[PDB]
Amino acid sequence: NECLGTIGPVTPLDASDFALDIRMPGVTPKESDTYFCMSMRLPVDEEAFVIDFKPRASMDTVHHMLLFGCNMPSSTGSYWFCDEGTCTDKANILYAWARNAPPTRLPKGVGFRVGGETGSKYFVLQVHYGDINHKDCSGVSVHLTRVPQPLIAGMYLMMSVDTVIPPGEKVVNADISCQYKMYPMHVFAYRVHTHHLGKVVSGYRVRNGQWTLIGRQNPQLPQAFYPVEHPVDVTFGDILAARCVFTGEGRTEATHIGGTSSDEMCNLYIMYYMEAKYALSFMTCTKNVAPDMFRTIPAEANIPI
Ligand SMILES: [Cu+2]
Ligand SMILES: [Cu+2]
Ligand SMILES: [Cu+2]
């Protein structure tokens, strides 16, 4: 989308709502596959709710975009190569826009809580320029409101930390599992993330030994937030389990979890909503509490998609 210029990034939408445009400050990538980041402090200190996102992407060059909420962006600059990092503190993903997989809207009545005393103070935008003098102001327009939402969006991130993929190894599974101990959450979307060695990624809710699919996807396909086939509640006592299937074929050395292309990642982002009075905005699982449970994981978790 065009650079904003004189009107600025804040557009009043009504007395209690406004649109905040988070855009690259006229950048001009010089290499293929460049990742740029920029941040914006929220204009209001009090709590607000993010209830909608509208992509403003230059269809030709922009491969994908991600928007995070955090309190300490990696750089205080105008923009930077994200290899410097997205946030120093924990970055809370709010939205993903991938070129060949249009995003799905948030369910009405659902909003992410930001600002205030405990919410994110900054938005951090990451734009991935794939195919490239002209300045690009691609980004996202966020719809914010002061009106408390009845349902609060949050994120349950399942991620491996210890995976080691031996060179040439045929199959390597990275399993993650935690017991859920909060009020109930309803999963409505999910996103998988792996680098080049990932074949398939699947997440499940396990209740009384029974496995319910949350999402299963080939991480090589656009890493968008895809809608869940059917809303899945997860309640106190349930166990969340995820498995990423990797291969070492093609590598001459071992691959471990890390930030570079030569490293791997096994991440499953589970986006959910919770009743406002019970809601917590984020949870993470980097452990594998029920290792043997995977002896009963659906076969689909190992068959590519
Ligand atoms: Cu991309
Ligand atoms: Cu339900
Ligand atoms: Cu990664």
Curated annotation (Swiss-Prot):
Chain residue ranges for the region called Peptidylglycine alpha-hydroxylating monooxygenase: 1-305
Impact after mutating residue 265 to I: Abolished peptidylglycine alpha-hydroxylating monooxygenase activity
Domain of life: Eukaryota
Protein location: Cytoplasmic vesicle, Secretory vesicle membrane
Result after altering residue 63 to A: Impaired Cu(2+)-binding
Disulfide bonds: 3-137, 37-82, 70-87, 178-285, 244-266
Binding-site residues for Cu(2+) 2, renumbered to this chain: 193, 195, 265
Effect in UniProt of substituting residue 128 to A: Impaired Cu(2+)-binding
Residues at which Cu(2+) 1 binds: 63-64, 128
Family: In the C-terminal section; belongs to the peptidyl-alpha-hydroxyglycine alpha-amidating lyase family. In the N-terminal section; belongs to the copper type II ascorbate-dependent monooxygenase family.
Subunit relationships: Monomer. Interacts with RASSF9.
Function in brief: Bifunctional enzyme that catalyzes amidation of the C-terminus of proteins. Alpha-amidation is present at the C-terminus of many endocrine hormones and neuropeptides and is required for their activity. C-terminal amidation also takes place in response to protein fragmentation triggered by oxidative stress, promoting degradation of amidated protein fragments by the proteasome. Alpha-amidation involves two sequential reactions, both of which are catalyzed by separate catalytic domains of the enzyme.
Name this polypeptide is given: Peptidylglycine alpha-amidating monooxygenase
Organism this protein belongs to: Rattus norvegicus (Rat)
